[PDB]
Amino acid sequence: ATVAPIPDAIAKHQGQIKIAVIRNLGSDDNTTQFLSGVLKEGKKLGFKVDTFLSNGDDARFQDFVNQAISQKYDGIILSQGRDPYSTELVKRIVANGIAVSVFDTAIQGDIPGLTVTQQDDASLTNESFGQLVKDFNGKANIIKLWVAGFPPMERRQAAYQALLKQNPGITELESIGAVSSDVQGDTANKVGAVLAKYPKGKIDAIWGTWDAFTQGAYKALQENGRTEIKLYSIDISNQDLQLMREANSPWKVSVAVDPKLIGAVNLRLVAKKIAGEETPASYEFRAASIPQALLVSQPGPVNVSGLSKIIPGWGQSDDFNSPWFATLAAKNG
Of the two residues 54 and 292, which places its CB atom closer to ligand 8GA in the complex? 54
The set of residues, in sequence order, having a beta carbon less than 8 Å from that of 148 and lying 6+ positions away, is: 154, 157
Interface stretch with ligand 8GA, choices 46-54, 84-92, 147-155, 245-253 (CB under 6 A):
147-155
Determine the 3-state secondary structure of 295 from DSSP. helix
Report the nearest approach of ligand 8GA to the CB of residue 210 (Å).
3
Give the per-residue contact string, 6-45, with ligand 8GA (x = CB under 6 A; - = no).
------------------------x---------------
Q: Examine residue 299 and say whether the peptide bond preceding it is cis (omega within 30 degrees of 0).
A: no
Interface stretch with ligand 8GA, choices 59-67, 107-115, 146-154, 320-328 (CB under 6 A):
146-154
Please check whether residue 79 is in contact with residue 24, taking contact to mean a CB–CB distance below 8 angstroms. yes
Could you give the CA distance from residue 198 to residue 220 in angstroms, rounded to a whole number?
Answer: 14
Determine the 3-state secondary structure of 254 from DSSP. strand
Interface stretch with ligand 8GA, choices 9-17, 63-71, 106-114, 144-152 (CB under 6 A):
144-152
Could you give the CA distance from residue 271 to residue 75 in angstroms, rounded to a whole number?
Answer: 8
Count CB-CB contacts under 10 A for residue 315: 21
- Select the residue interacting with ligand 8GA from 104, 127, 186, 204 (CB under 6 A): 104
Of the two residues 205 and 262, which places its CB atom closer to ligand 8GA in the complex? 262
Residue numbers 162-191 binding ligand 8GA by CB under 6 A: 179
Residue 43 phi/psi, 5-degree rounding, is -60, -40
- Asked if 210 touches ligand 8GA (CB under 6 A), the answer is yes
- Select the residue interacting with ligand 8GA from 75, 130, 152, 216 (CB under 6 A): 152
Of the two residues 98 and 255, which places its CB atom closer to ligand 8GA in the complex? 255
**Sheet with strand 205-208: strands edge to edge:** 170-176, 140-145, 205-208, 230-234, 251-256, 288-291
Compute the half-sphere exposure of residue 29: CA atoms within 13 Å on the CB side of its CA. Answer: 21
Of the two residues 74 and 235, which places its CB atom closer to ligand 8GA in the complex? 235
Of the two residues 226 and 252, which places its CB atom closer to ligand 8GA in the complex? 252
- Select the residue interacting with ligand 8GA from 234, 236, 267, 287 (CB under 6 A): 234
Report the nearest approach of ligand 8GA to the CB of residue 108 (Å).
19
Could you give the CA distance from residue 30 to residue 36 in angstroms, rounded to a whole number?
Answer: 10
> Going by DSSP bridges, is the β-strand pair 75-79/114-119 parallel, antiparallel, or unpaired?
unpaired
Strand ranges for 4-74 from DSSP E: 18-23, 48-53
Determine the 3-state secondary structure of 17 from DSSP. coil
Could you give the CA distance from residue 101 to residue 227 in angstroms, rounded to a whole number?
Answer: 41
Q: How many residues bind ligand 8GA (CB under 6 A)?
A: 12
Could you give the CA distance from residue 329 to residue 326 in angstroms, rounded to a whole number?
Answer: 5
Residue numbers 261-280 binding ligand 8GA by CB under 6 A: none
Report the nearest approach of ligand 8GA to the CB of residue 124 (Å).
7
Task: Note the helical H segments in 224-258.
Answer: 238-245
- Select the residue interacting with ligand 8GA from 17, 20, 116, 147 (CB under 6 A): 147
Residue numbers 43-102 binding ligand 8GA by CB under 6 A: 80
Residue numbers 270-329 binding ligand 8GA by CB under 6 A: none
- Asked if 240 touches ligand 8GA (CB under 6 A), the answer is no
Instruction: Return residues touching ligand 8GA (CB under 6 A).
Output: 30, 80, 104, 119, 147, 150, 152-153, 179, 210, 234-235
